[PDB]
């Protein structure tokens, strides 16, 4: 479910992203758009509002590592499963994030890339990425 031809594009494109901004932004959006996700992050201090959540350094911080995991996810594309086999543990037995929530973070990622890349981010190229997030979110929930 990713051809060598399907793999360029998404590997190509992917080094046009501001991985770190992008990231910070997903996680804020995720948190604002899906308010209950705020639980797993009560410790990050204030989330009273849209802006607080956006301009909160730890959202931003956490912004950076998750998109980091995609990047590393991206490098390893045939073995998401195991690249993310540890991060299932953390996410499943420990914080017990329900699977559905992963999906939500992917879809949101997608939205963030469409806003940053506008029409550079084509319908075709967004279909391949859907296969990235799906697989990632498939993989994060494997130990379920």
């Amino acid at each position: 479910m990713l051809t060598a031809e399907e793999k360029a594009a998404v590997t190509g494109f992917w080094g046009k992203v501001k991985v770190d901004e992008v990231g910070a932004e997903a996680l804020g959006r995720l948190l604002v758009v899906y308010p209950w996700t705020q639980r797993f992050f009560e410790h990050f201090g204030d989330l009273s509002s849209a802006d607080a959540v956006m301009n909160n350094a730890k959202v931003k911080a956490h912004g950076k590592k998750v998109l980091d995991s995609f990047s590393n996810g991206m490098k390893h594309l045939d073995d998401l499963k195991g690249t993310f086999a540890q991060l299932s543990e953390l996410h499943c037995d420990k914080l017990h994030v329900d699977p559905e929530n992963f999906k939500l973070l992917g879809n949101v990622l997608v939205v963030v890339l469409a806003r940053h890349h506008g029409s550079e981010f084509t319908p075709l190229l967004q279909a391949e990425f859907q296969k990235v997030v799906a697989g990632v979110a498939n993989a994060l929930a494997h130990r379920y």
Binding site: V32, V33, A50, M54, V111, S119, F121, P123
Partner: protein, 138 residues
């Protein structure tokens, strides 16, 4: 449901404008590339990029949200004729609404970066949520 959603979803929809059609089509097409199961509800459509019917129907979807947006108070009101179609005849599985709604959020974002903030985006999403809990309910 939440003035301050309504507010935003107006402003959301107001900037979209008469490009709602062009976006309806585009999300439609994005839905279809990204989620081909969806095609299966459309075997009577030629689905090649830039089909007339796809174009046609994106319009008809853009326009039904436009309707849903200014008339936001009563929902199973002004879309009862659409629940009917989607819930009853087409019997559409409600997972595809998550799919088609995602795709508009996508398209919008891509045509309106500056108007697509995290707050209006939450709205747009709660909104599309009712729209489909309605379209699917009775």
């Amino acid at each position: 449901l939440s003035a301050a959603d309504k507010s935003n979803v107006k402003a959301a929809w107001g900037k979209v404008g008469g490009n709602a059609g062009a976006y309806g089509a585009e999300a439609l097409e994005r839905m279809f590339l990204s989620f081909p199961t969806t095609k299966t509800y459309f075997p009577h459509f030629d689905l090649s990029h830039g089909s007339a019917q796809v174009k046609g129907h994106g319009e008809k979807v853009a326009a039904a949200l436009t309707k849903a947006v200014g008339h936001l108070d009563d929902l199973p009101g002004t879309l009862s004729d659409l629940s009917d179609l989607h819930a009853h005849k087409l019997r559409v599985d409600p997972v595809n609404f998550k799919l088609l709604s995602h795709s508009l959020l996508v398209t919008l974002a891509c045509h309106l970066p500056n108007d697509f903030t995290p707050a209006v985006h939450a709205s747009l999403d709660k909104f599309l949520a009712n729209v489909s809990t309605v379209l699917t309910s009775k």
